[PDB]
Ligand SMILES: Nc1ccn(-c2cc(O)c(COP(=O)(O)O)o2)c(=O)n1
């Protein structure tokens with residue numbers, strides 16, 4: 001009944017990954033994803049490969065398609081490199097075995113082949129093979145960290161904590177993520193401190209409130225409205241940190257504009273890193289990743305001063321633009337859901353930010369297809385919400401849909417949108433009564 | 434100053450070329466202090482401009498290495514950036530039609546900045562600037578990074594100046610860079626005793642020092658004794674003004690030929706604050722084949738810096754043991770010796786005085802040579818670059834600078850030695 005026993009089973013695999021890296025002297029290709037979790041894993045792998053005297057070539061892909069894998073296969077012909085896949089690989093393992101890659105797969109997504117040792121050439125470190133839920137108990141950067149600690153590089157756990165936040169696995173903190181955080185505390189690489197979300201930004205509080213999207217508070221979402229609210233309740237809006245009296249006064253007033261004020265409180269992680277707040281670094285890597293600035297994201301993980309300066313500039317441009325995108329949403333209410341039409345890459349992010357009491361579905365039309373992205377919260381699921389079954393009703397409209405209880409998608413022909421949404425609305429009202 | 438405006442034409446074009454490239458990028462540097470510093474300048478510059486890259490560190494840019502690299506142009510043609518190499522191999526790079534940028538301070542084969550619309554070559558000799566005295570390969574990389582405003586990278590340029598022994602005297606473009614790093618507050622200069630850079634006990638700092646090498650003090654015990662006799666606590670780690678005066682007078686008296694005990698220290702903005710120490714640290718890890726660790730030291734990683742300190746002192750001890758057992762053999766106008774792969778260059782440098790020194794080691798069926806001279810020797814017509822080139826007469830290859838060059842041959846060590854002593858008689 002111990003995390004210790006499960007680690008001993010995982011450590012058989014990480015030992016083999018370690019020996020495999022040390023004894024390789026050819027080229028090394030690292031392939032990672034572009035979100036916070038992937039850029040974190042990239043930085044963990046980068047530091048770890050350098051410390052073990054391994055030069056490497058890092059590439060970032062949004063999706064590991066058949067085309068990308070075949071394009072990669074054309075590098076095996078001349079100098080067959082060792083490939084390390086982070087946050088990807090397990091679902092595409094068939095195509096990786098087909099081309100006979102020399103490969104290490106570090107993936108928390110559900111696996112296709114539940115084996116750690118695939119043949120003589122491919123090692124797969126996936127927590128699902130050990131009975132650990134990769135959607136709640138570990139992230140991709142956690143998986144790389146498990147490898148990194150085989151070399152005793154505990155200082156890299158701070159990048160794992162970043163990925164834990166990036167993937168929204170910090171509340172509640174479960175399984176291996178809890179083990180990682182506690183190890184980082186034991187080795188003095190993180191300090192944990194309950195605090196208000198607005199103090200993570202180290203800027204003027206009225207700007208931290210104005211552009212916050214976790215939670216998004218519409219009535220406070222502008223410098224002017226935020227300044228006014230802070231002046232009225234006796235707080236200097238130019239301060240960059242709220243003390244204990246400030247936070248009481250703030251929370252006391254704000255509960256009228258935004259009643260679920262437990263969302264305003266977090267456990268802050270202060271990390272051994274130039275960007276000392278892990279929540280801020282998580283948001284920075286996200287913004288940088290969304291703007292295509294992958295290499296700058298790696299530099300941030302590597303603590304370079306000018307990448308950090310870029311990242312700080314891109315973060316605030318990104319946060320301002322997101323608030324504007326949010327103010328422009330035409331939110332339509334049905335009986336048990338909200339819905340809106342938005343842009344292709346935003347509807348998922350925006351729907352999640354807009355949830356409060358009811359689920360939110362955003363959709364965009366492309367050609368004659370409408371693609372939907374639906375979001376809830378833990379309070380809704382506990383009242384019997386399940387989005388995967390409600391998005392599955394798309395098959396009745398000549399489409400299909402599924403996902404998780406709290407997040408799901410679906411596709412439908414452009415002209416059945418109104419009738420799909422009315423059907424989804426009724427299913428959800430069923431799931432609540 | 435006037436020459437910067439002429440160089441700035443090529444640096445601008447290099448900038449636009451890198452910016453507008455969106456495929457793969459290959460960076461090829463050398464393993465000495467200068468090439469590793471170049472690796473660090475290009476690594477940070479490329480990240481800051483949003484370029485992923487594949488860095489490789491090679492010991493010789495041979496015909497064979499070039500041919501292996503060119504098979505990467507068949508599928509997805511990368512932009513190649515060559516640092517501290519490529520100018521003498523320019524003929525083979527054109528042959529294979531690399532999309533390339535050559536950042537090299539070795540004497541050029543072709544004397545053009547813009548080769549064939551596909552190659553840019555930034556060589557200081559093109560502009561009448563001496564790649565042996567006035568600029569290093571780091572400084573060439575720094576001249577590009579300037580174009581982006583990455584002035585903080587000047588500290589790695591200073592590390593290359595020291596590593597390529599161009600700090601005393603400080604000339605030309607190196608002087609521009611140093612002053613630029615001082616104006617932007619990235620370096621502080623302070624005159625001090627050489628032994629104060631190591632931040633270890635003084636008797637160890639003396640025992641293992643090789644600039645200057647003092648054979649009678651090159652031992653923990655003899656150094657411990659020498660300091661106790663003259664009234665200095667040998668367990669101290671920094672010498673104050675009074676101990677500096679007492680150590681100087683004692684060393685200079687017993688060894689009046691000695692020099693370079695007082696140096697201008699460069700305190701850089703870097704986790705390894707002393708650039709002289711950083712220069713030695715990078716040299717040590719390079720000679721041990723720890724290329725990625727050297728990059729990591731430039732990128733200021735704590736664990737890499739930890740390795741570099743351990744390796745550095747292992748290296749300085751082995752070096753002292755090698756110097757006490759060297760079999761210097763005189764020919765007509767050179768000395769020569771056999772040694773270990775990672776020492777023959779540095780030992781040649783330390784021993785050189787009155788005549789050029791060539792060291793070599795055997796690896797497989799090949800012998801690799803390393804020839805060194807002084808500025809005093811180069812002023813009298815010494816040119817190791819031409820003299821080592823004679824290795825093509827023995828089915829080989831050789832080149833470098835006037836003052837420091839290398840070569841490879843097979844079973845013709847004594848013969849090619851003689852043929853080079855011949856070329857160095859004529860030169861003198
Ligand atoms: N037929 C489908 C379509 C989508 N999904 C899915 C997975 C996932 O994580 C989400 C939520 O994210 P998105 O769909 O991108 O809003 O949806 C599914 O399971 N079955």
Ligand SMILES: Nc1ccn(-c2cc(O)c(COP(=O)(O)O)o2)c(=O)n1
Pocket residue numbers: 493521539778802803804830831832833834837838839840
């Ligand atoms: N065919 C060659 C071999 C060596 N070099 C070279 C560059 C450099 O800085 C030194 C110093 O000498 P070594 O440390 O012996 O390589 O040599 C060259 O340019 N062409």
